[PDB]
Paper text:
Topoisomerase II (TOP2) enzymes are essential regulators of DNA topology during DNA transcription, replication, and repair. Topoisomerase IIβ (TOP2B) plays a role in transcriptional regulation and is expressed in all cell types including post-mitotic cardiomyocytes. Both isoforms catalyze the reaction, where one DNA duplex is passed through a transient double-strand DNA break in another DNA duplex. The ATPase domain of TOP2 is highly conserved between TOP2A and TOP2B and is composed of an N-terminal strap, a β-hairpin that is unique to eukaryotic TOP2, a GHKL ATPase domain that binds and hydrolyses ATP, and a transducer domain that conveys mechanical motion to the DNA binding and cleavage core of TOP2. Here we describe the development of the obex class of TOP2 inhibitors that bind to a previously unidentified druggable pocket in the TOP2 ATPase domain to act as allosteric catalytic inhibitors by locking the ATPase domain conformation with the capability of isoform-selective inhibition.
We have been unable to obtain crystal structures of nucleotide-free eukaryotic ATPase domains, and to our knowledge none have yet been described to date. Therefore, a comparison of the AMPPNP and AMPPNP + obex inhibitor structures reveal that the obex binding site is pre-formed in the ATP-bound state of TOP2, suggesting that topobexin (9) fits into TOP2B like a key into a lock and blocks subsequent conformational changes that could otherwise occur upon ATP hydrolysis. Residues surrounding the 5c pocket are largely unchanged from those observed in its absence, suggesting the ATP-bound state can easily accommodate 5c.
Numbering used by the authors:
A (entry chain A), B (entry chain A): 44 to 362, 365 to 432
Write the structure that this text describes.
């Protein structure tokens, strides 16, 4: 093999298709137990087989819609549609659209720049301490690259125009955008057909649809002041506590006693629920409406407070050694938080790495909350083990 | 704020400095309990404060050296030097050097291409089923970008020349390489001064040095057939079992009984040790000499086999329900494995996501190993809990 065959340089676009994993996660199937929202049973935990990268390209567009609530606090609604037969997914939001105007430096329409060129973002100036989920300038282009058809429609009264442009064939083909006069209520709608061949799939099957549906429920629970519709029907979740109820309101512990679920909205940026776990530590958490399914420093920040206080309570009835991991083993925690300029080790944003001193706010749980935590069965499980 | 201030495009090089986290991990301090190799006590677990991105740029160069054992199986030695006073780190390896010749497509010397331009690699052709750690074509450039001085020296008898080139100021300045006749024993040596200002550090302190030193011990344990020297002295680790001994050979369980450590080299590509944990599930694992500190499917693949067999043993003395997470809670596992074309969700490569069917080999632990596992205190811990 020649020097030129061995030592190769790739373009950014080539690298995404060759090495999709650090951009969207695995493009091969994964089977694991997890929470989904099924047509027959609603929220449930079961074995699911799905391709992470396909789930992620949907997530990128969904979080972008949630992020618009930061650009326009008057936004009220996100509508999600999934049609497996046609292979069409659409995510629509109201509030301010995207300026339909030529960017004077890049010499293209703003929506064409930020959906059709890599490393483009309104989130690159960190002197603004934003609580958007978007950080890197990739997500929407990644969905485009992994779609056979990707359409951006946006309407922005301030700039008096609407914009519609369609890309095809993994962002490699497009045509002139349709620009029209507009003076109505702003919106953005992203409609895409995922390139299932990139994920070795024949169709959007029940498992991936159940995961994408649950993500819409997550959004209804995490994005304050935004109602969510799925396939034309409003989701009956009106805040984080009602979302948490989907997991624990109808559940018993192993002794047949209903789970005691405690809750505190510490402040606008920190909403916490907690109950007993009997299958090891569990956490369901959101940072800026991103599902941080591998946790991060926000989870540790909340959990460490609870663990410290519960160790205190146990000690007052111990008289041998109760270690923090043993307490954490009995905790099921739910967190919805807003973090300024969060960091993650991956574009997938499953683990949030920013240290608490940089969050821009604190979550100092009240003594009332800690007392309630001492009554939800965790202490009893530990003390029974101190025998 | 104007459209041009709000909506911004970044170059690849700008994006690395603006968003370092998905390239090298966090550039802010982190404090946590972990294993390091200290000058006073050797291998020990203690609270450490360090900057992940600094540790990672060192790791990138170290794994590149290990990877040369795949290019040249005759390689025998890696030498690591760290001088905190001068702020100079060097990593040297023998075996084949890098061709000192002009790349006919890129029109630069091969070493200048692959250390000085992004997205350059000999690991981009996956039809070769390689067990190198390198996959993405970033690591060496990331170290260069995060160094105030970065020197590449390589000597390649086949091409009859040696090469030395120095970059400065975060890869933004360089000068003509020194090319000389060479007909000796090949080597490559990477010498760099990390840009401590990028990590808000004044010096390479004891904690970061102890982490980097432990990584050299990891390499002595994981890279078959390669001896490792640190600051001029050979590390007395001659294989994976002797490496594992640094953690467990002198340890007792909480009842005062020595840990029973079991071992099986299932085949050339899978080396496994296992013992009892009393602080929850623990894993120390390597994929292609990468420290997979967040685990991955290789860990799950090994652990699930052990858990399944130990549940069998417990059941034969149970007569209530023993759940897999409870068994895993008592396992400390050590894995050194070689995986073809591994995948990870991050450039940092802490979690290996490739499914076992794609590994290119299997690890089917023997019935002898499972019997030994049933005698290392895990079953006893579980059974005592079934009371
Ligand atoms: N629904 C939307 N409404 C308004 N603006 C949007 C919407 N979706 C995307 N944008 C804009 O398009 C830009 C590019 O989106 P995207 O590629 O996802 O990058 P990002 O969200 O800034 N960062 P990341 O998602 O971390 O890669 C965003 O920064 C927004 O300015
Ligand atoms: N010590 C070394 N000896 C020989 N070749 C080397 C050495 N270090 C680096 N290289 C070469 O330089 C290339 C670029 O290194 P690097 O930037 O780390 O990319 P990579 O190792 O291929 N992938 P990654 O580390 O996953 O980003 C490698 O692919 C090798 O061909
Ligand atoms: Mg985004
Ligand atoms: Mg490398």
């Amino acid at each position: 093999a020649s020097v030129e065959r061995v030592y190769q340089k790739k373009t950014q676009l080539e690298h995404i298709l060759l090495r999709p994993d650090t951009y969207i996660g695995s493009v091969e199937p994964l089977t694991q137990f997890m929470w989904v929202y099924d047509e027959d049973v609603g929220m449930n935990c079961r074995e699911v087989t799905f391709v992470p990268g396909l789930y992620k390209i949907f997530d990128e567009i969904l979080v972008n819609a949630a992020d618009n609530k930061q650009r326009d606090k008057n936004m009220t609604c996100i509508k999600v549609s999934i049609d497996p037969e046609s292979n069409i997914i659409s995510i629509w939001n109201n509030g301010k659209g995207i300026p339909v105007v030529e960017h004077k430096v890049e010499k293209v329409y703003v929506p064409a720049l930020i959906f059709g060129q890599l490393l483009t973002s309104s989130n690159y100036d960190d002197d603004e301490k934003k609580v958007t989920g978007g950080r890197n300038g990739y997500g929407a282009k990644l969905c485009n690259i992994f779609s056979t058809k990707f359409t951006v429609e946006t309407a922005c009264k301030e700039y008096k125009h609407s914009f519609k442009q369609t890309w095809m064939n993994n962002m490699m083909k497009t045509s002139e955008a349709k620009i029209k006069h507009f003076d109505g209520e702003d919106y953005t709608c992203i409609t895409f057909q995922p390139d299932l061949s990139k994920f070795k799939m024949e169709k959007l099957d029940k498992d991936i649809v159940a995961l994408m549906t649950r993500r819409a429920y997550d959004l209804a629970g995490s994005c304050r002041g935004v109602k969510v519709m799925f396939n034309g029907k409003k989701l009956p979740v009106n805040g984080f506590r009602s979302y948490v109820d989907l997991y624990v309101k109808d559940k018993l512990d192993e002794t047949g006693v209903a789970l005691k679920v405690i809750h505190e909205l510490a402040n606008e940026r920190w909403d916490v629920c907690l109950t007993l776990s009997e299958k090891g530590f569990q956490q369901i958490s959101f940072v800026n409406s991103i599902a941080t399914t591998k946790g991060g420093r926000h989870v540790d920040y909340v959990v460490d407070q609870v663990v410290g206080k519960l160790i205190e309570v146990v000690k007052k009835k111990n008289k041998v050694s109760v270690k923090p991991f043993q307490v954490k083993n009995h905790i099921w925690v739910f967190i919805n938080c807003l973090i300024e300029n969060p960091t993650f080790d991956s574009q997938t944003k499953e683990n949030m790495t920013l240290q608490p001193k940089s969050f821009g706010s604190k979550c100092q749980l009240s003594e009332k909350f800690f007392k309630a935590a001492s009554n939800c069965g965790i202490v009893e499980s530990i003390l029974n083990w101190v025998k």
